[PDB]
Symmetry: none
Subunit: 198 residues, 2 copies
């Protein structure tokens, strides 16, 4: 039903790429990234830190956008949205529409887009230089449905596409990662990595 | 209701909170857990909170306190006193009976019912430390138990403390969880043991 945004990795002029913390797989972890799977595992509505790395500084007014798509070919034309249960939660922070799967945490300049032509959802923030004593910028994302939610993702894998954009929205860079939103991210990362090694 | 930001922000003046070291004896009425960033206190008892800055903010700076529910699914609900305690004859002459958080012993305290969000807050002028001291102390009271039915109803809350200029613009922000309970020392010990075992 909708055109599919590109997921092709594109570093661009500024050498744009993502990075992830090394959180491990203990029972207490709430967000953990698998480099072998290029896959983030996270709990519902919990902080997911994503690093933005560049080789050179983009202009003021550069923005960073996040959008989810279904990974599998037969589902990629379907808009990823919150399930019929969670979209009816009165849990908006006042910026995010209740249908949106991906939110930004702790940024009052976050903007949420419902695309008038494709109906896809995305959240965009200004790109900012690293804080004092840091080499990268970090964005905190929250995912507001479980991968297993019926009538929503319904156990289908998704990708998050992160795009670096100029102030008009033109593409400057692109990267992406798979996401599973689940109750036990550490256990599930261990299982999927063990499965991969066999 | 939209959700106030809880992001820690030291700002230009290096603003942050501090708490005295009270211990967990059975006789303690107010005790702070740094490991949990959580204050445990009895109903309507004095809670001293230290205000620290690295440099002096301008005259007319104010300090506001507001409570929100900690859990995502409840953050949009206004935190207020339960149907029982809002009808207690316990007015101090300044605080409206519906407000959970009071400032004790400050005749310049002002209480706000926000006309757009309906949230409650209490604000006082920010003052420099007394002679011989290095920080300023505010005394708060929490006027409902965490367990009160029809009020917090066993849901955790956060207190957000904001440093504001004379127009109400943000200069600094800090926050902490609160449990209002009959046995704060015992409950702090239990929750800290639970955290270690996790
Ligand atoms: C965005 N804007 C600026 C900078 C720098 N330096 N980095 C990003 C990711
Ligand atoms: C508020 N106003 C002034 C000062 C100083 N010095 N501190 C506060 C917390
Ligand atoms: C809870 N904690 C301490 C004490 C005392 N003394 N009593 C209770 C109920
Ligand atoms: Zn859902
Ligand atoms: Zn009550």
């Amino acid at each position: 039903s909708s055109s599919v945004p590109s997921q092709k990795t594109y570093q661009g002029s500024y050498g744009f790429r993502l990075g992830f913390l090394h959180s491990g797989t203990a029972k207490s972890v709430t967000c953990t990234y698998s480099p072998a799977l290029n896959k983030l595992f996270c709990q519902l509505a919990k902080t997911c830190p994503v690093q933005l790395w560049v080789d050179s500084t983009p202009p003021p007014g550069t923005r960073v956008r996040a959008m989810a798509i279904y990974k599998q070919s037969q589902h990629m034309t379907e808009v990823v949205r919150r399930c019929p249960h969670h979209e009816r939660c009165s849990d908006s922070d006042g910026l995010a529409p209740p249908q949106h799967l991906i939110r930004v945490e702790g940024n009052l300049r976050a903007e949420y887009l419902d695309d008038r032509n494709t109906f896809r959802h995305s959240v965009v923030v200004p790109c900012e230089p690293p804080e004092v004593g840091s080499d990268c910028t970090t964005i905190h994302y929250n995912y507001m449905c479980y991968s297993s939610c019926m009538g929503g993702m319904n156990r289908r894998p998704i990708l998050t596409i992160i795009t670096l954009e100029d102030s008009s929205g033109n593409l400057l860079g692109r990267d992406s990662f798979e996401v599973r939103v689940c109750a036990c991210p550490g256990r599930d990362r261990r299982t999927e990595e063990e499965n991969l090694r066999k």
